[PDB]
Design a protein around this ligand. Sequence first.
Ligand SMILES: [Zn+2]
Ligand SMILES: [Zn+2]
Lengths: 814, 115, 62
Amino acid sequence: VYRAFDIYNDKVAGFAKFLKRLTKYTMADLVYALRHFDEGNCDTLKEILVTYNCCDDDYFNKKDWYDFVENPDILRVYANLGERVRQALLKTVQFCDAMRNAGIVGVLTLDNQDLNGNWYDFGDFIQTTPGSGVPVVDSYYSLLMPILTLTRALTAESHVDTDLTKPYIKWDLLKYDFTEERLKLFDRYFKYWDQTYHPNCVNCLDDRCILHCANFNVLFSTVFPPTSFGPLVRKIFVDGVPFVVSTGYHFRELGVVHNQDVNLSFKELLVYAADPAMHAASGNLLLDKRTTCFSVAALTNNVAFQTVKPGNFNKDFYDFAVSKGFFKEGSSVELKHFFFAQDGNAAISDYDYYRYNLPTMCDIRQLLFVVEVVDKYFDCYDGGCINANQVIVNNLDKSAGFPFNKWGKARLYYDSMSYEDQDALFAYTKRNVIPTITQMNLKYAISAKNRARTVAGVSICSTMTNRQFHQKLLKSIAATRGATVVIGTSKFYGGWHNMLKTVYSDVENPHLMGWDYPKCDRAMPNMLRIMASLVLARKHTTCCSLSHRFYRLANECAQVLSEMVMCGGSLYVKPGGTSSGDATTAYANSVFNICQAVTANVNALLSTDGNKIADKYVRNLQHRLYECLYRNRDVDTDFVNEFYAYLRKHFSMMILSDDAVVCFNSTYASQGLVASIKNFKSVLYYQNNVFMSEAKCWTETDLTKGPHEFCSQHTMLVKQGDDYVYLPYPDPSRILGAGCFVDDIVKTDGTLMIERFVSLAIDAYPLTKHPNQEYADVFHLYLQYIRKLHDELTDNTSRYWEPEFYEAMYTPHT
Amino acid sequence: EDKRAKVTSAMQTMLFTMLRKLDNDALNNIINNARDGCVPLNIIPLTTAAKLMVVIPDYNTYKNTCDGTTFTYASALWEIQQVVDADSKIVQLSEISMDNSPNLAWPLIVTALRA
Amino acid sequence: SKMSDVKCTSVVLLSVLQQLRVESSSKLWAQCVQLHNDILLAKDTTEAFEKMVSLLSVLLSM
RNA sequence: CUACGCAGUG
RNA sequence: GGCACUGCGUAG
Ligand SMILES: [Zn+2]
Ligand SMILES: [Zn+2]
């Protein structure tokens, strides 16, 4: 029968299904089932769950028994296995000790350990002098890592004497330095993981060491009480009056970090006010039973409830549209996009969606190789730190965060500080940690679903320092055309056609596909966000030292990843995820997307049988992929280049931060040499902790039709100028709703509507070439409406309502 | 420069006035309990704040957490001073019951003082 | 038709209810929001008219 | 090119 | 009453 095996021989190498007291299943079957997840074939996973009392078959009769978001109770069922996993870990160490006490050198594989933890393997072992045996546990531990936090194997470390029956451990409420406990945890479970582990990531040597140590800390921080993590504060004496200020931080992933300018000016006042220390110290204690998210304090005398009012309605546009034959029964274009009003509990209920963010431990060897490959997608860009006078800021009339929104906009702070002050602040952030407070606001815009959208407004210190750190690389990425990341590449003036031709380039049997990330902004693991920041910061090999770059990374971690979130006047802690109002949200999201695609490709190429691969080049590439993944500690630039070229040939990606189009050789994917939809589903299941459904991910066989959807835009091949070009058109219901339903009533009368409708007629011109007469009539509706508004208002103006205007913006001349 | 002076003055005033609200009676003791003098931020509200606010979404949570006039939280004994609903109106303790729960405008914000 | 116009009228009535200081009351505004969001998301005309009548009654109570 | 407004996208 | 990108429109 099919069993999961991890093999590394002279002919085949991978982690794949092969045809082949002692339990029915082994640990590798558990790891394979939880990693390569397919809801169609869950028989091994169901048998494993039922056999070991995690649940019963009646649990599977319900729908969505596997989904994390829809059925959070599954997180308990998986956790009901975690203790078993923990026992395995302990037994593993014992086994290793025995080998080291018998002078045996061997490679430990998952398939040799049954689900009770026993090891029934004694082959592949080379005898040596007793006492000098060196177990090899890179593959075993590295593959088992994602199961350690999925099943919560380290819960029993929170109890006295490690007994699940005994009560919790009463750690001192004042304790913050858990370094000795982290050493004990590492030496108890990962005793033979040879790479040096630094509980405080200040001691880390480079980016890869930071990733490795932070990966271990993420697992080890689930044991300790959640009240210890967060800013560390100390009483200082400013001019004799006792302040309390943050002189450090405690990161779930980076350990304890201590400021270097601890001393006991407008910059120093900003560092004090942005600090949540004073606010969370003078505020009243708060216990919010509405959310399971940890709460800190209440900054006001009452809890605030914010209601989203319903959107306005354009009677004129609706009347004109129904006078033109729209919105009839059985038609194709309707009103499907509305302003959905919300009640007072909307903000906190949407903040509660962070319960989907779980502590995720990543496959560290796989993540290191994947970050090596992902860095290749950003080598055609240059970046570095810049001075304050080189920083470009788009809008200076935006909020400055909290508490800075009380006194003015960001323009006031940029005018107050001289360039020397901003440079001094940036240099301060290179040596110290400055925790900030980010507000959550409710968004007010057209949407097709009743759910509300929350935006995380960040403070001004984070914005300024992150701009100075990242703007050169950001503008480099936003001004490069023809690369994987298409941020900054307009879809106008033949942009969409050039993008599509770039994606189609040199693929033997090209099919297209696409997917989406469910709850991307909330369910993202923290390790992937750290990796994205490290990839963005790799462009500082000469301007910043190691310590400066680490303290900058700690700054993003403390101001974006785990900052204090002020909702309704109350301070909560953010478990993780991303801040949608961050400076580098789109680019870190693009790095995360490329990471997930590369991980899918690696899993697809490694889970192939290998023996049945008829291509010798692909078989050798798979063998060297396993070698460079779980056998080589230092980077292999040659094979990274080779795998990057292999992907760029057989997997062409078009990425905008969440929305991706992949043109792939269909023969290779059907053979199992390239990622498919099921590989992405498995990858998002075992890393992103979310289930991806086939309804929201699509495939396309004929390139002429083009991508089904990209950036909420369909595409179509048309003829103009004797040339077949790809034009993007939107869903006409979206445009009709935008016309009918307005954000504010002022945009119901005046000149403003004209411009608005122009920018809606520009985006609805391609619908003219659609075969459906309703879609084509949408455009003429908009043009007749613009003409009617212009007539009501009453040579240079007639050019707004002629089709030549909107035709000229899809010809690639300009 | 005048705007810079105004912003600095406002920030200093906010820090000073809010430092007036900051109590050193238990802060000194909890700092002294720390050998290095550094304490987590999340611990200061638990051990130093006098007033506590609890937000109750449903009657089940109310009877589970703060049913009596004096309840416990953070290993401390708190006595209820006021109860308000989401409309910012006073709600008496006798009004909160399973029979009258459908008539109340949940959630309820209950304010207590440390005893 | 009969669906689009009832959805538009539900939107305008929720807007005028909000202008009538209904959002001060938590329960009344929550009920109005639920009715309006179920009307807009509805695909059946019978449910649309039923919730439309209920929302209009909420408006007419004052 | 710099300012302000609008629209679209994540 | 947030970040980024793109495209309009009025001004030197
Ligand atoms: Zn390290
Ligand atoms: Zn730099």
